[PDB]
A paper describes a structure:
PRC2 is composed of four core components: EZH2, EED, SUZ12 and RbAp48, although it may interact with several other proteins. Each catalytic cycle of PRC2 transfers a methyl group from the cofactor S-adenosyl-L-methionine (SAM) to the ɛ-amino group of H3K27. The catalytic machinery of PRC2 resides entirely in the C-terminal SET domain of EZH2, although EZH2 itself is neither stable nor active. Here we report the inhibitor-bound crystal structures of the wild-type (WT) and the oncogenic Y641N PRC2 consisting of human EED, human SUZ12-VEFS and engineered American chameleon (Anolis carolinensis) EZH2 (AcEZH2) subunits.
Interestingly, two of the prominent primary oncogenic mutations identified in lymphoma patients, Y641N and A677G, are positioned in or around the I-SET. Tyr641 and Ala677 are highly conserved among lysine methyltransferases, are structural neighbours in van der Waal's contact with each other and form an axis around which the I-SET ‘swings'. In our attempts to structurally characterize Y641N Hs/AcPRC2, we noticed that the solution behaviour of the mutant three- and five-protein PRC2 is significantly altered relative to the WT: the mutant is prone to dimerization. Monomeric Y641N PRC2 when analysed by HDX-MS shows increased baseline dynamics (of EZH2 subunit Fig. 6a), suggestive of the significant and far-reaching consequences of the substitution. Nonetheless, Y641N HsPRC2_4 does remain sensitive to inhibitors currently in clinical development and the inhibitor 1 reported here, suggesting an overlap of the conformational space between the WT and the Y641N PRC2. This is further underscored by the crystal structure of the Y641N Hs/AcPRC2 in complex with inhibitor 1 reported here. Y641N PRC2, on the other hand with significantly larger change in the sidechain, overwhelmingly favours dimethylated H3K27 as the substrate. The HDX-MS results suggesting greater dynamic character of the Y641N PRC2 and the proclivity of the mutant to dimerize, further emphasizes the far-reaching structural consequences of this specific substitution. Hydrogen/deuterium exchange mass spectroscopy (HDX-MS) analysis of the oncogenic mutant PRC2 suggests that Y641N substitution has far-reaching consequences on the EZH2 protein dynamics rather than just creating a more spacious substrate-binding site.
Author numbering:
A (entry chain T): 561 to 688
B (entry chain F): 68 to 426
C (entry chain A): 9 to 71, 81 to 124, 166 to 180, 193 to 199, 219 to 246, 260 to 308, 432 to 472, 517 to 733
The structure:
Amino acid sequence: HNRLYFHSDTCLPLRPQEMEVDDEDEKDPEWLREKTITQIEEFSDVNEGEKEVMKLWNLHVMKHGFIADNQMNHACMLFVENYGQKIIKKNLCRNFMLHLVSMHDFNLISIMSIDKAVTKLREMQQKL
Amino acid sequence: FKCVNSLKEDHNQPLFGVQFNWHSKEGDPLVFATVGSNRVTLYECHSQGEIRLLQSYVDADADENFYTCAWTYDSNTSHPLLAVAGSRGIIRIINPITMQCIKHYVGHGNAINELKFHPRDPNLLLSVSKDHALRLWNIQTDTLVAIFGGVEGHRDEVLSADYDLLGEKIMSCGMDHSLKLWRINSKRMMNAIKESYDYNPNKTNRPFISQKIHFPDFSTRDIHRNYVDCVRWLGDLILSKSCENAIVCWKPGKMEDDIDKIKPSESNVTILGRFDYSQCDIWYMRFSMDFWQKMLALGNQVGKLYVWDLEVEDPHKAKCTTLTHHKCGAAIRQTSFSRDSSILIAVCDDASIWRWDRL
Amino acid sequence: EKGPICWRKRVKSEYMRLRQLKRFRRADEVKSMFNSNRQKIQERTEILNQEWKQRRIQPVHIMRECSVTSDLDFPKQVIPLKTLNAVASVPIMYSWSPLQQNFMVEDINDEIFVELVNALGQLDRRDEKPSDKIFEAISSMFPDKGTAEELKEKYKECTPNIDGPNAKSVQREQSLHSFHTLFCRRCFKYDCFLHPFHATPNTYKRWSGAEASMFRVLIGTYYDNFCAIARLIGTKTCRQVYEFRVKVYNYQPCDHPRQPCDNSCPCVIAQNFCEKFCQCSSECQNRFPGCRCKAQCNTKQCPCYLAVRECDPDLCLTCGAADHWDSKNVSCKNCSIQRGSKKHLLLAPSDVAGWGIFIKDPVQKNEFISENCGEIISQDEADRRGKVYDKYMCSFLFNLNNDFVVDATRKGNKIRFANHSVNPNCYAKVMMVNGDHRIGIFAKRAIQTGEELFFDYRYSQADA
Ligand SMILES: CCc1cc(C)[nH]c(=O)c1CN1CCc2c(Cl)cc(OC3CCN(C(=O)[C@@H](C)O)CC3)c(Cl)c2C1=O
Ligand SMILES: [Zn+2]
Ligand SMILES: [Zn+2]
Ligand SMILES: [Zn+2]
Ligand SMILES: [Zn+2]
Ligand SMILES: [Zn+2]
Ligand SMILES: [Zn+2]
Ligand SMILES: [Zn+2]
């Protein structure tokens, strides 16, 4: 109190109204979001289908900030709900299945998830 | 062109900026401003090469040193305004009618190398800094619309920037040998400008959210070998210079690629030509143009003043005229064409002003 | 059946022909570009000159004093000098990007050649009154570009997506190759910003071309459950699938197949525990077990805390490290870095010099304030960078371990503004957090509201 503070992102001063709140210190800074999708596109030997799945997966993981292996089964379910409409609309369902098996290969998700997600994607397409 | 006058400011320090008021009505006398030391001087142009000293301002700070200035107007008052800035990284808005410093902006982490007002919106000010970033301000609503810099911003000091004719894009250049394109016609940028005008501090406890623009719409290091200290658009083509005694006319992408269709991933540049001159291998030496973009002028470290006719097709066949005067032997920091191109003013390191009149 | 000296002259002639033509083409394209452009200038400068005409901007008039001297003998002018009222300036700061976690940073043309080859072939064709003699001649004239053997195979001139119209038919390891080599098992991301070493082959070890390649893959995951492989392929049935079948050191995971974690193991050599990421036996004696605490985990009684490690959300199942993902305040007080439960910090000019960081809310002794984030650089990149840094009297470099340095200069978080002091109120503790070294900033003593933060940079500078 009685000291003048500044926003870390603009160096502009704090008004008394704002009451010592500087919060452009968000979990997923926007730029990391564009940096990741930009870096994936830069790949020569990777196709446009595997590219769009990788980008969408990363943005999902970055939004929710998953940190445990135990979170991976729920991470696929949340992905198929939040990004399902986009997966269908962009024709990426086969590359998505390919991602689900990659996850199982990395011992991160159960076989039961590998198909519960696939079941949920079809249930979502039938809604069109 | 003929050297019709030469003036000398008392401070005896380099004059880094010279700018004509291109907002003067038809009939009104030709007024230009000069920045140098911690001073801001205003002059009126008259017949028989007579220059009349009008106004002079001084910063209360002795350690302030102004590098740049820009003219605008109050849309609801019809008053000309003069923005100035330099070493102390502070923008001042001077009203020469009121004879007051009506506004000021502190935000830049270092010195301001260039100030530019949007060609269509007088309230939108672009400031270029040594702190590696550009900043778009809305001087009506006193807010920071955006900060152009970050992860894919300038890795070193930003030396110059320019809006295009319609104000849809900015092209910046700096000490990192880079030229970066920043589209201000994007939905994000237009929404930010719209929202800035709506921002009323007296109706909220929350500050205005500035857009952080980390990525340009194009970037290149392939035009010059050293720092780039000047950039201006020539239509949809770019004119930029370094210390390699040449102004390079180039464009993003391949020969046939339309600027508005250039992707951020674009790895190509096309060099259309160059304007050759000598003894201008020192930095912070700026070229300028005619309102109608038909003339281009640049000064030497030895006081030679080069003027080219851009109207001719290939730049290798470009008509060059070398303006020289026996008494003019200092480094020409900047040039300025009167709106009608009847007058060309040049400012030097020795605190001198040189008036060159057309015909 | 034509002379080598002759063929070399033909190369030189055709090169200079093609090159002169391409040049003349570009010369025109340019003169066209300039014209097309000048109409754009005219059009637009008119738009501006019109806008200008509908404005009647007021003229400037005459106004401690200053004077102006004319060398071209015009009369001296004297005018009063108005003083611009002092404005206070903020301390110096250069551009930087916000980080929430660390960010790793690493330390003739083909167009004309083919034209010329074909332009010469056109002459070999005219010699009736892709030949080998044409390659030996170009190689002779352009030896650098390669031998006639090299230029022959150079002249001749990614797996297609399964969802695309051109979906070819390859193995399981070719359909998955991208996914497998680009995925980071450690942070669950493709082309991650922290882990540069690609996943060891054991980590990813548990009709139409679009159906055929999908079959080879699915019989690697599922094996003989064709009644389920059919459900996934969709466009087929068990019957159809059945028939098809018959036709301090940095931690890095270890992978020594058919070998134990002995004196020859990198983990063991670096004197590091095997983590959940290693490919060794589930029974590996060098693995870190985790803690069975009920709560707290902030005393030597907790093996995690004692080992200068945060809790593992996959091993520490009883303390609360594995739970309540929505909340940042949990039962386990040893997982603040990983969950990112930082404290509110405020930026203001320092009471010493430059910019400083001030805590918003009170903090107890040894309580976690913030993580010190930045770019992860090699000890060499740090040396290169340091040369530049020394010009500005900077040192925002902080050792992480023997291999890496976090550089908060280009990017980091608010704690980059904590100043140096030999009498600090904060300390830096590098902790092992789910296989990653992270610099934690904790209170040295109790800190009250609005207090400036200081830490002793010297302790973060010794790799002595
Ligand atoms: C972490 C920032 C910090 C921390 C604390 C506790 N207190 C503070 O006041 C500040 C602010 N601060 C101090 C002054 C400063 C200088 Cl003098 C040079 C700098 O960085 C060079 C800039 C040219 N560099 C380049 O690479 C150019 C030439 O391309 C190298 C790094 C920087 Cl990054 C800074 C800066 O931000
Ligand atoms: Zn990773
Ligand atoms: Zn091992
Ligand atoms: Zn191991
Ligand atoms: Zn082991
Ligand atoms: Zn515990
Ligand atoms: Zn534990
Ligand atoms: Zn615990």
